Design an enzyme around this catalytic site. Structure first.
Site, mmCIF file in Angstrom:
data_model
loop_
_atom_site.group_PDB
_atom_site.id
_atom_site.type_symbol
_atom_site.label_atom_id
_atom_site.label_comp_id
_atom_site.label_asym_id
_atom_site.label_seq_id
_atom_site.Cartn_x
_atom_site.Cartn_y
_atom_site.Cartn_z
ATOM 1 N N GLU A 90 0.835 -1.207 0.000
ATOM 2 C CA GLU A 90 0.000 0.000 0.000
ATOM 3 C C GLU A 90 0.872 1.260 0.000
ATOM 4 O O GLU A 90 1.390 1.646 -1.051
ATOM 5 C CB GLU A 90 -1.017 -0.050 1.143
HETATM 6 C C1 HEM Z 1 -3.712 6.297 6.274
HETATM 7 C C2 HEM Z 1 -4.247 6.065 5.069
HETATM 8 C C3 HEM Z 1 -5.495 5.155 4.994
HETATM 9 C C4 HEM Z 1 -6.619 5.201 5.747
HETATM 10 C C5 HEM Z 1 -6.979 6.180 6.889
HETATM 11 C C6 HEM Z 1 -7.506 4.133 5.296
HETATM 12 C C7 HEM Z 1 -8.764 3.792 5.775
HETATM 13 C C8 HEM Z 1 -9.265 2.501 5.754
HETATM 14 C C9 HEM Z 1 -10.358 1.911 6.533
HETATM 15 C C10 HEM Z 1 -11.259 2.617 7.574
HETATM 16 C C11 HEM Z 1 -10.470 0.631 6.191
HETATM 17 C C12 HEM Z 1 -11.474 -0.386 6.784
HETATM 18 C C13 HEM Z 1 -12.958 -0.121 6.511
HETATM 19 C C14 HEM Z 1 -13.715 -1.432 6.636
HETATM 20 O O1 HEM Z 1 -13.097 -2.461 7.009
HETATM 21 O O2 HEM Z 1 -14.935 -1.492 6.349
HETATM 22 C C15 HEM Z 1 -9.447 0.342 5.191
HETATM 23 C C16 HEM Z 1 -9.195 -0.879 4.578
HETATM 24 C C17 HEM Z 1 -8.485 -1.088 3.411
HETATM 25 N N1 HEM Z 1 -7.788 -0.129 2.671
HETATM 26 FE FE1 HEM Z 1 -7.307 1.700 3.443
HETATM 27 N N2 HEM Z 1 -6.846 3.474 4.269
HETATM 28 C C18 HEM Z 1 -5.633 4.074 4.046
HETATM 29 C C19 HEM Z 1 -4.717 3.714 3.083
HETATM 30 C C20 HEM Z 1 -4.897 2.792 2.086
HETATM 31 C C21 HEM Z 1 -4.147 2.681 0.845
HETATM 32 C C22 HEM Z 1 -2.987 3.603 0.396
HETATM 33 C C23 HEM Z 1 -4.639 1.637 0.168
HETATM 34 C C24 HEM Z 1 -4.221 1.062 -1.200
HETATM 35 C C25 HEM Z 1 -2.947 1.081 -1.623
HETATM 36 C C26 HEM Z 1 -5.709 1.074 0.961
HETATM 37 C C27 HEM Z 1 -6.476 -0.006 0.628
HETATM 38 C C28 HEM Z 1 -7.222 -0.683 1.541
HETATM 39 C C29 HEM Z 1 -7.556 -2.083 1.463
HETATM 40 C C30 HEM Z 1 -7.136 -3.078 0.359
HETATM 41 C C31 HEM Z 1 -8.404 -2.344 2.708
HETATM 42 C C32 HEM Z 1 -9.002 -3.689 3.146
HETATM 43 C C33 HEM Z 1 -7.807 -4.452 3.726
HETATM 44 C C34 HEM Z 1 -8.187 -5.615 4.611
HETATM 45 O O3 HEM Z 1 -9.396 -5.855 4.882
HETATM 46 O O4 HEM Z 1 -7.223 -6.300 5.037
HETATM 47 N N3 HEM Z 1 -5.854 1.808 2.110
HETATM 48 N N4 HEM Z 1 -8.758 1.511 4.933
#
Ligand code: HEM
Ligand code: HEM
Ligand code: HEM
Ligand code: HEM
Ligand SMILES: [Ca+2]
Ligand SMILES: [Ca+2]
Lengths: 307, 308
Positions: free
Chosen positions: A100
């Site tokens: 990420e």
């Molecule tokens: C600090 C920066 C970030 C914040 C605050 C953020 C916020 C969030 C939140 C709240 C969730 C969970 C929501 C849920 O489970 O319903 C999540 C999951 C996810 N986000 Fe982010 N995100 C960030 C950076 C990123 C980046 C840069 C990427 C892509 C390169 C990304 C891709 C994903 C993915 C693939 C998930 C699901 C992962 C899993 O379930 O293991 N996120 N993010």
């Protein structure tokens, strides 16, 4: 009714929410200096990248569909497997995640701390100019709590505006209850209140290996048990399911009926179900783009390509 | 005085501007569904990606430093080599550039035309809901023309406010004039009024192969002749030069004094100059993050990895 209305967010820490907003859009949280929270949770497009799985550092193909940050605080836990408890804990993950943002907590905090404009804000919020991952993620989480989507046409209907949704949409809400969708997708976020097996009556075919809750708990009964996602703004958050396999809400609702309930929907029933699900689209966050401070000679240089 | 003040944007066509803003932030104009204009001209960070050169489709390293969209309508031409006449013509490029957004004009317009909300806006601005690259790039340019940066400390000073800038910055500006920087960097944008040689007195030492105007004209006399950049907001648009080789304004000022003027700056002089240049940072665009319509079943899907 099993679904409740979402009320506008109450901001009680305005300095902190502003700092959080800046950080959510800050691409210098990433190794490349190119990827911010917004890159994958694009607030212009339903709080998601709208791709099958994420594009990360070095254009690396991500393992799982990016869920929406919209109404994320109504979730019982965070991530598909619930391995994070709240939004502050979650935010630590992406910064340090190789697929990420590809950075580290240490590099992120040094980068932010290089800039007096950021340091001044941490001092106003927390008491001094130190930047650590707790404060940085706390600020991000405070901002994300503002990203609720009130005033969906459905919410206006629940509040008594009988003309706020179509008859198709009204029949779709009734189907939603009567078929048992609501048994898993309920509360203000029409989802987010429980973990449940994906493929309760029939298995869910995917070539995506993610085992969900089993990877947090170790329990085999927890295999392919995921957080039930919010259906708020589901119209905007294609493609669907954790594997990003399904592009149309038509197919998603039929896959859910088929494997969660044991029977797919009719053409008319799908029309109705989709109508209801679209009416769950709420007012999208109205945010001014934040103006971020300049890097200086103490700011680590980004490394988009080689070194 | 050879520098003029930047007045706020006259917004005469706000519906077109709105449409233009959406498109500037619209990542479905790229093949990947992941890159928008704002990606490389990030309006949170000075209208630039602040990378030596740009990250494009498939994370390709681009050949040259992305310039700021801030004050870009003041430029006599667009691109480092001046190959586009104005913002409208310019905007057509990146959409179809394989190293940038990697799309095609035909696919971009089909993608936008697929969504009723977009078609409705095209209708409201242009009279019918057809989308072609002409209207698409017209709307983007309309939005870009709003991205001026009024009210910089130096502008306040030009208007007579003596405490608008520091003593250093004042000395900075007299040096900028006296040493001859203003011969190439003048007018409202402190730049963009001409193409000049990079390396007028001495060669610019770079590993970047870009030829500048010669790449467009073929002329040997145009070799390493580049559009003189705006120095407005130069504080925010590191790293510097078309090769993105220099991260401090200190280095940038010394390189210019040396190779364009044959001059070496005292440490106090460089500090004065940098104070002056820093005073050119204006009020940044204050805009609402646009809400884009949902794709539907006629919207081409993004293709982040597939070659076809
Ligand atoms: C600090 C920066 C970030 C914040 C605050 C953020 C916020 C969030 C939140 C709240 C969730 C969970 C929501 C849920 O489970 O319903 C999540 C999951 C996810 N986000 Fe982010 N995100 C960030 C950076 C990123 C980046 C840069 C990427 C892509 C390169 C990304 C891709 C994903 C993915 C693939 C998930 C699901 C992962 C899993 O379930 O293991 N996120 N993010
Ligand atoms: C026909 C009735 C139902 C409909 C229309 C429906 C709707 C949906 C939709 C549109 C999604 C995709 C969300 C997203 O990708 O963000 C989803 C996911 C999910 N739903 Fe349902 N749902 C129904 C019944 C159920 C039931 C009965 C359960 C529990 C027994 C359940 C549990 C889940 C889970 C665990 C997911 C995430 C699955 C995954 O992607 O691995 N749903 N639902
Ligand atoms: C339609 C979307 C875009 C718009 C409206 C736009 C705007 C502009 C403008 C106005 C200029 C010329 C300014 C000047 O020379 O002073 C320019 C040049 C440039 N932009 Fe963009 N840009 C877009 C997409 C992109 C993307 C996606 C990237 C990165 C992948 C990028 C990177 C660059 C680079 C490297 C140059 C200089 C190229 C050269 O001089 O030949 N641009 N852009
Ligand atoms: C000490 C006096 C000068 C100072 C402080 C100065 C300042 C600067 C700065 C900070 C830049 C970087 C702009 C950017 O990367 O966006 C720049 C670029 C440039 N300036 Fe100057 N300048 C001076 C004299 C001159 C002169 C005399 C000329 C013409 C003979 C000139 C023409 C240019 C050109 C063509 C570029 C772009 C070169 C390239 O990157 O290929 N400047 N200047
Ligand atoms: Ca999704
Ligand atoms: Ca630059």
């Amino acid at each position: 009714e099993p679904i409740e209305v979402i009320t506008p967010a109450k901001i009680t820490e305005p300095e902190k929410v502003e700092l959080g907003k800046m950080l959510f859009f800050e691409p210098r949280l990433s190794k490349s200096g190119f990827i911010s929270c917004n890159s994958c949770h694009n607030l212009s497009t339903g709080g998601v990248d709208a791709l099958p799985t994420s594009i990360g550092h070095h254009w690396q193909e991500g393992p799982i569909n990016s869920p929406t940050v919209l109404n994320a605080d109504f979730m019982l836990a965070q991530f598909w497997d619930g391995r994070a408890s709240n939004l502050k804990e979650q935010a630590a993950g992406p910064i340090a995640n190789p697929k990420e943002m590809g950075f580290t907590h240490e590099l992120a905090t040094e980068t932010i701390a290089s800039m007096p404009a950021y340091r001044a804000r941490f001092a106003k919020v927390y008491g001094d100019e130190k930047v650590d991952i707790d404060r940085l993620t706390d600020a991000i989480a405070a901002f994300e709590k503002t990203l609720v989507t009130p005033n969906s046409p459905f919410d206006q209907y629940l509040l008594g505006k009988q003309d706020a949704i179509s008859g198709d949409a009204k029949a779709g809400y009734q189907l939603f209850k009567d078929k048992g969708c609501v048994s898993c997708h309920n509360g203000p976020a029409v989802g987010g209140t429980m973990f449940m097996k994906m493929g309760l009556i029939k298995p869910f075919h995917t070539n995506n290996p993610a085992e969900g809750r089993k990877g947090v708990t170790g329990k085999d009964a927890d295999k392919f048990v995921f957080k039930v996602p919010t259906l708020r703004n589901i119209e905007l958050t294609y493609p669907y399911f954790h594997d990003g396999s399904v592009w149309t809400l038509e197919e998603a609702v039929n896959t859910m009926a088929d494997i969660q309930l044991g029977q797919k929907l009719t053409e008319k029933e799908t029309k109705e179900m989709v109508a209801f699900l679209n009416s769950l689209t709420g007012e999208q966050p109205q945010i001014s783009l934040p103006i971020l401070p300049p890097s200086n000679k103490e700011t680590p240089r980004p490394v988009p390509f080689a070194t």
